[PDB]
Amino acid sequence: ASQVRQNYHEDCEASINKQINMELYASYVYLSMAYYFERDDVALPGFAKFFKESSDEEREHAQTFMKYQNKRGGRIVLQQIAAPSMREWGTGLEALQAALDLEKQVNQSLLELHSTASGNNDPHLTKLLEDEYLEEQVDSIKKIGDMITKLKRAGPTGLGEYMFDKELN
Amino acid sequence: ASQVRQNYHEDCEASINKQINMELYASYVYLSMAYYFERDDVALPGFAKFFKESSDEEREHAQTFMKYQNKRGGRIVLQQIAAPSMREWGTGLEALQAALDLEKQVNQSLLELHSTASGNNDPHLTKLLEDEYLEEQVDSIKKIGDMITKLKRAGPTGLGEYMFDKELN
Amino acid sequence: ASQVRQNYHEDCEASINKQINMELYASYVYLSMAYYFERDDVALPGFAKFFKESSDEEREHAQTFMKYQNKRGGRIVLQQIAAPSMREWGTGLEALQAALDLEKQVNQSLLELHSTASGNNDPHLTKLLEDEYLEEQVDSIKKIGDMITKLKRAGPTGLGEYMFDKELN
Amino acid sequence: ASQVRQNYHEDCEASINKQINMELYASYVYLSMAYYFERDDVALPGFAKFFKESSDEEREHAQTFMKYQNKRGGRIVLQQIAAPSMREWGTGLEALQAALDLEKQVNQSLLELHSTASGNNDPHLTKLLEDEYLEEQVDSIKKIGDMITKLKRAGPTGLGEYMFDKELN
Numbered sequence: 153a154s155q156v157r158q159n160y161h162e163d164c165e166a167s168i169n170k171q172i173n174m175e176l177y178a179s180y181v182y183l184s185m186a187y188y189f190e191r192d193d194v195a196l197p198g199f200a201k202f203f204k205e206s207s208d209e210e211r212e213h214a215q216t217f218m219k220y221q222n223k224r225g226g227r228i229v230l231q232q233i234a235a236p237s238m239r240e241w242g243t244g245l246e247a248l249q250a251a252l253d254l255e256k257q258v259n260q261s262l263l264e265l266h267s268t269a270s271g272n273n274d275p276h277l278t279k280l281l282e283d284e285y286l287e288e289q290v291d292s293i294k295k296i297g298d299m300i301t302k303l304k305r306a307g308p309t310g311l312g313e314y315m316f317d318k319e320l321n
Numbered sequence: 322a323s324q325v326r327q328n329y330h331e332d333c334e335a336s337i338n339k340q341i342n343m344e345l346y347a348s349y350v351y352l353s354m355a356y357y358f359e360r361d362d363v364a365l366p367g368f369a370k371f372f373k374e375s376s377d378e379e380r381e382h383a384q385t386f387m388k389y390q391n392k393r394g395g396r397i398v399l400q401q402i403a404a405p406s407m408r409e410w411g412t413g414l415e416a417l418q419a420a421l422d423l424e425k426q427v428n429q430s431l432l433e434l435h436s437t438a439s440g441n442n443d444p445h446l447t448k449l450l451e452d453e454y455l456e457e458q459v460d461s462i463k464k465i466g467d468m469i470t471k472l473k474r475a476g477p478t479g480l481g482e483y484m485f486d487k488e489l490n
Numbered sequence: 491a492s493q494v495r496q497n498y499h500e501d502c503e504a505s506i507n508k509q510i511n512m513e514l515y516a517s518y519v520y521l522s523m524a525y526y527f528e529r530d531d532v533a534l535p536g537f538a539k540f541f542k543e544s545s546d547e548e549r550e551h552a553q554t555f556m557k558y559q560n561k562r563g564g565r566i567v568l569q570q571i572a573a574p575s576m577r578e579w580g581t582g583l584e585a586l587q588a589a590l591d592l593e594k595q596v597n598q599s600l601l602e603l604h605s606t607a608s609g610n611n612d613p614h615l616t617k618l619l620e621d622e623y624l625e626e627q628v629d630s631i632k633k634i635g636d637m638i639t640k641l642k643r644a645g646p647t648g649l650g651e652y653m654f655d656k657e658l659n
Numbered sequence: 660a661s662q663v664r665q666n667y668h669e670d671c672e673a674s675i676n677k678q679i680n681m682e683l684y685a686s687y688v689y690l691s692m693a694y695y696f697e698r699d700d701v702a703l704p705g706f707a708k709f710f711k712e713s714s715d716e717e718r719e720h721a722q723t724f725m726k727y728q729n730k731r732g733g734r735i736v737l738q739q740i741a742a743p744s745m746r747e748w749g750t751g752l753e754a755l756q757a758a759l760d761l762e763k764q765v766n767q768s769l770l771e772l773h774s775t776a777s778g779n780n781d782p783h784l785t786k787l788l789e790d791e792y793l794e795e796q797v798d799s800i801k802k803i804g805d806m807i808t809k810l811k812r813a814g815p816t817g818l819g820e821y822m823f824d825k826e827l828n
């Protein structure tokens with residue numbers, strides 16, 4: 153084992169590798185959305201910027217798990233990053249709804265990782281998950297939920313979508 | 322011939338003079354649009370400003386071709402600048418659609434001159450076209466396409482046109 | 491077709507989608523290398539920083555192609571990003587040798603795209619490739635070649651690798 | 660009991676007293692190392708500085724536990740600080756290896772305290788341990804592991820030790 157490894161269960165190590173891939177996948181979904189909103193026939197620059205920033209944040213979250221794996225003496229195993237399932241994301245509202253679903257899927261995986269860490273009596277890992285992942289995940293879900301409600305109020309299509317996008321920019 | 326002339330084909334020289342006239346014509350079209358949008362019964366100051374700036378940019382493009390003709394030792398031949406095809410340009414959307422078509426007509430002319438320059442083995446001229454014209458032309462076409470999509474989303478008439486115009490201003 | 495599309499061949503559009511994927515793959519390879527060099531049993535922070543920066547630059551290159559696709563009215567079609575071919579990259583020298591080979595593979599792909607663009611008489615695309623890709627690619631290959639020579643001189647293992655890494659940091 | 664005491668188990672109080680002593684001992688070990696590296700026949704000022712700083716940090720960790728004991732209404736019971744096990748610490752590498760082992764021994768003790776606190780349903784104490792101790796302990800172990808790898812690469816004796824020490828200074 154690594155000279156640094158202590159109290160680090162193989163199941164936690166393996167689950168962190170799976171979570172790295174999930175965060176990279178989420179980053180790729182948001183990158184797809186960002187550039188979809190820059191198509192000449194879509195032209196929603198506020199949505200584009202929101203998803204660009206979201207993509208960067210998910211990549212940073214993946215990198216924090218990679219750093220964490222090394223800190224604990226685990227070994228990073230990277231796998232293929234699947235392309236998002238659709239080429240086009242529909243209306244701004246449909247993209248936000250897909251993002252909300254994805255954020256909750258990621259949250260569920262993080263909570264399952266927390267359960268694995270707790271069951272293996274790894275408080276360093278439960279602290280990481282609580283402070284660096286679960287907190288931001290709840291804030292992200294709340295933000296997207298607010299945005300969905302605001303967009304339903306404004307529009308969600310036509311002038312209201314145009315105005316909502318401008319406030320988002 | 323001019324003491325400076327070297328590798329400069331008469332067909333390229335003549336086509337440059339045609340491009341100068343086309344750019345001056347485009348400048349005149351956009352000047353007409355700019356002041357149409359300042360009529361008391363139109364009153365779209367964002368559209369007016371957009372077309373004023375566009376008119377100035379096309380005049381600058383014409384001047385860069387005039388400077389180029391002199392750099393290569395060709396002789397500038399200026400001709401009449403045709404009146405724009407319309408006295409009144411309709412809605413903001415109709416003006417943008419006319420602008421998109423004009424920008425694509427200009428792009429086609431520039432690409433045809435690029436072909437003439439390539440066929441005459443004139444890389445100084447292909448460089449000029451690529452760097453000083455074709456690049457900005459694609460960016461302009463993309464910008465106007467985005468604007469058309471945004472205006473169709475906002476409006477394209479009534480309150481949405483009013484709001485889109487303000488964002489443009 | 492898109493309202494903006496002009497002189498943009500479907501084969502060029504498809505090849506741009508391939509290049510986006512290749513750039514994202516290169517970004518992933520360099521990300522893998524960066525964190526390999528942060529393992530507690532590797533501990534080469536100069537190499538880690540070099541590959542982190544390289545990863546970010548390749549992702550930016552991918553994003554510029556995504557923006558380009560939209561500018562021309564093509565449609566981004568993302569593909570799965572393959573896993574890097576190795577979990578462990580060996581010595582610093584072996585990683586640089588792998589990077590040199592990857593940079594030359596990317597260069598070959600860019601030159602093939604350039605040939606496709608030239609054969610389809612698309613000077614906007616040849617300009618993009620020359621100015622935004624081929625130039626930086628030659629500079630990157632020269633930099634890595636220099637680094638390989640310097641590391642062979644210093645080391646390439648032991649104290650020389652330790653000292654070379656410091657200079658890189 | 661103290662007027663402030665609430666949900667504070669006597670076993671946790673006693674274990675905090677043990678940890679205070681362990682931290683003071685670690686501080687003394689690192690103080691011994693620091694001055695060993697300032698002997699005229701050792702003369703490794705980077706190692707000396709690293710261990711001086713480490714000694715101060717361990718004393719601060721002990722003081723935070725003393726403050727904590729008082730915050731909860733426990734009573735500080737100090738114990739003799741044992742002499743370090745060696746008068747002479749050998750090579751820089753041997754000292755780092757001894758430090759790694761000591762850091763892991765302290766980590767094990769902190770994890771045992773965490774288990775005691777968790778079993779006694781004391782989340783204020785688990786929070787202290789996670790945030791103020793376990794986090795820095797993993798970072799310290801990773802840093803020392805990196806240093807051991809770097810020193811093995813550089814040297815670990817002779818010129819490599821001289822150069823590694825300079826980088827540490």
Ligand SMILES: [Cl-]
Pocket residue numbers: 402403404405
């Ligand atoms: Cl006329």
Ligand SMILES: [Mg+2]
Pocket residue numbers: 157158159160
């Ligand atoms: Mg263990």
Ligand SMILES: [Mg+2]
Pocket residue numbers: 307308309310312
């Ligand atoms: Mg609606």
Ligand SMILES: [Mg+2]
Pocket residue numbers: 495496497498
């Ligand atoms: Mg065409």
Ligand SMILES: [Mg+2]
Pocket residue numbers: 664665666667
């Ligand atoms: Mg009580």
